[PDB]
Amino acid sequence: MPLENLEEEGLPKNPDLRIAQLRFLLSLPEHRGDTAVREELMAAVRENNMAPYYEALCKSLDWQMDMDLLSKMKKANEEELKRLDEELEDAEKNLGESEIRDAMMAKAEYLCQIGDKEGALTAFRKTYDKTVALGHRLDIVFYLLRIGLFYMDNDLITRNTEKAKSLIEEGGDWDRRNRLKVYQGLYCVAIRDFKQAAELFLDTVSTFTSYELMDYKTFVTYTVYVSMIALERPDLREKVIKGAEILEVLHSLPAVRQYLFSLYECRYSVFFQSLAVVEQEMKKDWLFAPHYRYYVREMRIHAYSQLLESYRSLTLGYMAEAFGVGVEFIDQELSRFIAAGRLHCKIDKVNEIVETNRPDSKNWQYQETIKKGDLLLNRVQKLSRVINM
Amino acid sequence: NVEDDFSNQLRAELEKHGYKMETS
């Protein structure tokens, strides 16, 4: 529910989309009352084309906030904060079992919606300790977590996550567990790693509740793309197409599945078509990192990797044809990967034959041992002098 | 190295052009 705001706020942020995108982003805060969260989200971005207000930046986004939106924003943020003050006060005096637990709870849907950290830090923590219906506790801890993600503060988010971790096994509700997987994953992308995020994400696909989450169609497409950056072609490909995922969903996967399918088929020609369509639809609607490099780079090597494994020699003429991308472009894309050490092939362009070093036996490994060794040794020589003195 | 997405965008467009004419 408040999760719907981050994905929309991603839309002006990413480089596949820009200016129009603010009008849609603006509509959601009036409707939900998420208004405080949106205002907060402008600061978090720190200018990548955002801030649709008549208050400031009227033509800079070429969209603006409405007058009703402004009065409602103020009304909603103040009401929640106002209630919070009195409930915090009244609650202490009476029963600790009942009164405080209820009072914090009453605030809590509203408190996350506004995204106000300060009021939240004290109120949220008190509820959890005292046992009641176990499913209820889990739901509540989730609202505390939503506030911290909005700012992109590392500290606040990590702090929030820990209370949930303790609680989840305690309740044991596997439906509720699945929610904790999504929050961690957003945060995991937030630092950098899609790789961590991917592992969590794959689990969430099984059992799904759309409460405190956006929608099930949005998430499945996210999960298959994030899985892919982490996982190689054999296992992910088999799960999405041959398994349940496309049949049940009733088609929203086609962009990401096409991208995996080409590798399986050994017709690279589809791979290159699939890249543009997946990039805009699936990957880039994200507040937490609309950063193509991890996705794109990992997929480009996976495509080459299988081709290199299957033959000791190839022609250029075959490579160029299969991909369909040009001779120069294929060389250029490769230049990064070989140099980085993702791959290890060469193209003798002028004679149009490609020689491939195989990944088999001690030799490929000897090359490898040395690579880890040089840096290790370098760190060692520094260490020997510093400790000794 | 890293921060590839920017150049990547340019790579994708040009590549398509080359991709249509050449492909089998």
């Binding site: 054999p234 041959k242 398994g243 349940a244 049949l247 049940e248 969903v249 009733l250 399986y264 088929e265 050994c266 017709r267 299988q306 081709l307 494994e309 299957s310 033959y311 000791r312 020699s313 190839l314 022609t315 075959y318 034959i353 195989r358 990944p359 088999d360 036996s361 001690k362 490994q365 000897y366 490898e368 041992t369 880890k372 060794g373 840096l375 290790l376 760190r379 060692v380 520094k382 260490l383 510093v386 400790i387 003195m389 | -």
Partner: protein, 422 residues
């Protein structure tokens, strides 16, 4: 008594006398009157009403009259107020499902029915309607919906249960989840099914599903083809009295066991035309073509057949999984004999043994190398296939590679600690 005495005569008369377009008009008016009826027993009248309308369900057809007529069966069902009655109605539903109409109509009629059974009256009828909706959903490829409908019910009918009709929802669930590729869920539905079913005594149709369903679990999961074959025979015998989509799924399976054995002759010996001819089309022929293919030792026969057949693959889990094993196995057999005496074997020679074209074998081979299911390499620069001993890695070095990595993190830690000295 009214449903039989005037209604059946009047319906037969309108249809016999004046044209099929003319009668449709009379027919609408007759069903409206039916609500009230003029019954002297609600019980009897309702069993017969549902039966007479049930002639229309069987076609199934896509007429205007067909959609509206379907609506009438639902209040009539609630009013029936007899247990024995449920089985009758089930059969008419089976016939609506076997012969396809539009996707949308078929799903909605069954959805609406589930909710009304619940409103007016017992869980017992609500449950019976459910078996059919879940069956039809796997064919439509609306799995997500099938999962929600079947899972929800289970707890509620549990305190009710002493009755034969409830097992059937459990039987149907297992099939839909197994096609879905959710083995825990399929196994769960199986768990419920044999404990509840007790002994066979239950309607011939009910017995027909009980025997058929135990066979699927045994064949795919536990790999007991012998026990599976024997199950399928019993089931077949029970299916002959009715026509349902369930009856055709029984025909596939008996043939399937033989193909599995890897004697293709047995398959040909066995054929039982009794259910097969009714349903004849693509589903009947498929089991024989697959057998032909196994016999020939041609990948191509198998390859062609599989594309057309994919709707059949989706329909039942058993066929999809075993055909994948067979295709893959066959490729594997053909390939082993080709590599084994020749290293740098000619492309024409692999094309010829497998029975494919040169382009097609190389493509498929690419995938196989990656899996490393013969530990060779396809050399494009001569267009020759090479099999040699080229084992991936070795044990000392592989483990050592991981050891050198770990040390790198340790020396870093040592660098942090080390800061304090300076």
């Amino acid at each position: 008594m009214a449903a039989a005495a005037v209604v059946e005569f009047q319906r037969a008369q309108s249809l016999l006398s004046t044209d099929r377009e003319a009668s449709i008009d009379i027919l609408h008016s007759i069903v409206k009157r039916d609500i009230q009826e003029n019954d002297e027993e609600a019980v009897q009248v309702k069993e017969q009403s549902i039966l007479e309308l049930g002639s229309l369900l069987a076609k199934t057809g896509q007429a205007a009259e067909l959609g509206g007529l379907l609506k009438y069966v639902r209040p009539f069902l609630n009013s029936i107020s007899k247990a024995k009655a449920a089985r009758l109605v089930r059969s008419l539903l089976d016939l609506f499902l076997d012969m396809e109409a539009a996707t949308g109509q078929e799903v909605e009629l069954c959805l609406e029915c589930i909710e009304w059974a619940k409103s007016e009256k017992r869980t017992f009828l609500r449950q019976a309607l459910e078996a059919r909706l879940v069956s039809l959903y796997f064919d439509t490829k609306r799995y997500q919906e099938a999962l929600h409908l079947g899972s929800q019910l289970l707890r509620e009918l549990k305190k009710m249960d002493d009755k034969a009709l409830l097992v059937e929802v459990q039987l149907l669930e297992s099939k839909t989840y197994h096609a879905l590729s959710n083995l825990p869920k399929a196994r769960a539905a199986l768990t419920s099914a044999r404990t509840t079913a007790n002994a066979i005594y239950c309607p011939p149709k009910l017995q027909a599903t009980l025997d058929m369903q135990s066979g699927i679990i045994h064949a795919a999961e536990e790999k007991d083809w012998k026990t599976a074959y024997s199950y399928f025979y019993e089931a077949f015998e029970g299916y002959d009295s009715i026509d349902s989509p369930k009856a055709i799924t029984s025909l596939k399976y008996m043939l399937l066991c033989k193909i599995m054995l890897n004697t293709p002759e047995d398959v040909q010996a066995l054929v039982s035309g009794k259910l097969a001819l009714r349903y004849a089309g693509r589903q009947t022929e498929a089991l024989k073509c697959v057998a032909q293919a196994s016999k020939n030792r041609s990948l191509a026969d198998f390859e062609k057949a599989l594309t057309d057949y994919r709707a059949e693959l989706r329909d039942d889990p058993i066929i999809s999984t075993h055909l994948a094993k067979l295709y893959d196995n066959l490729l594997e057999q053909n390939l082993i004999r080709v590599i084994e005496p020749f290293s740098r074997v000619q492309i024409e020679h692999i094309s010829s043994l497998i029975k494919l074209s040169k382009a097609d074998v190389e493509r498929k081979l690419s995938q196989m190398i990656l899996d490393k299911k013969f530990h060779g390499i396809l050399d494009q620069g001569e267009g020759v296939l090479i099999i040699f001993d080229e084992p991936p890695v070795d044990k000392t070095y592989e483990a050592a590679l991981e050891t050198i990595q770990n040390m790198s993190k340790v020396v870093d830690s040592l660098y942090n600690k080390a800061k304090k000295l300076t």
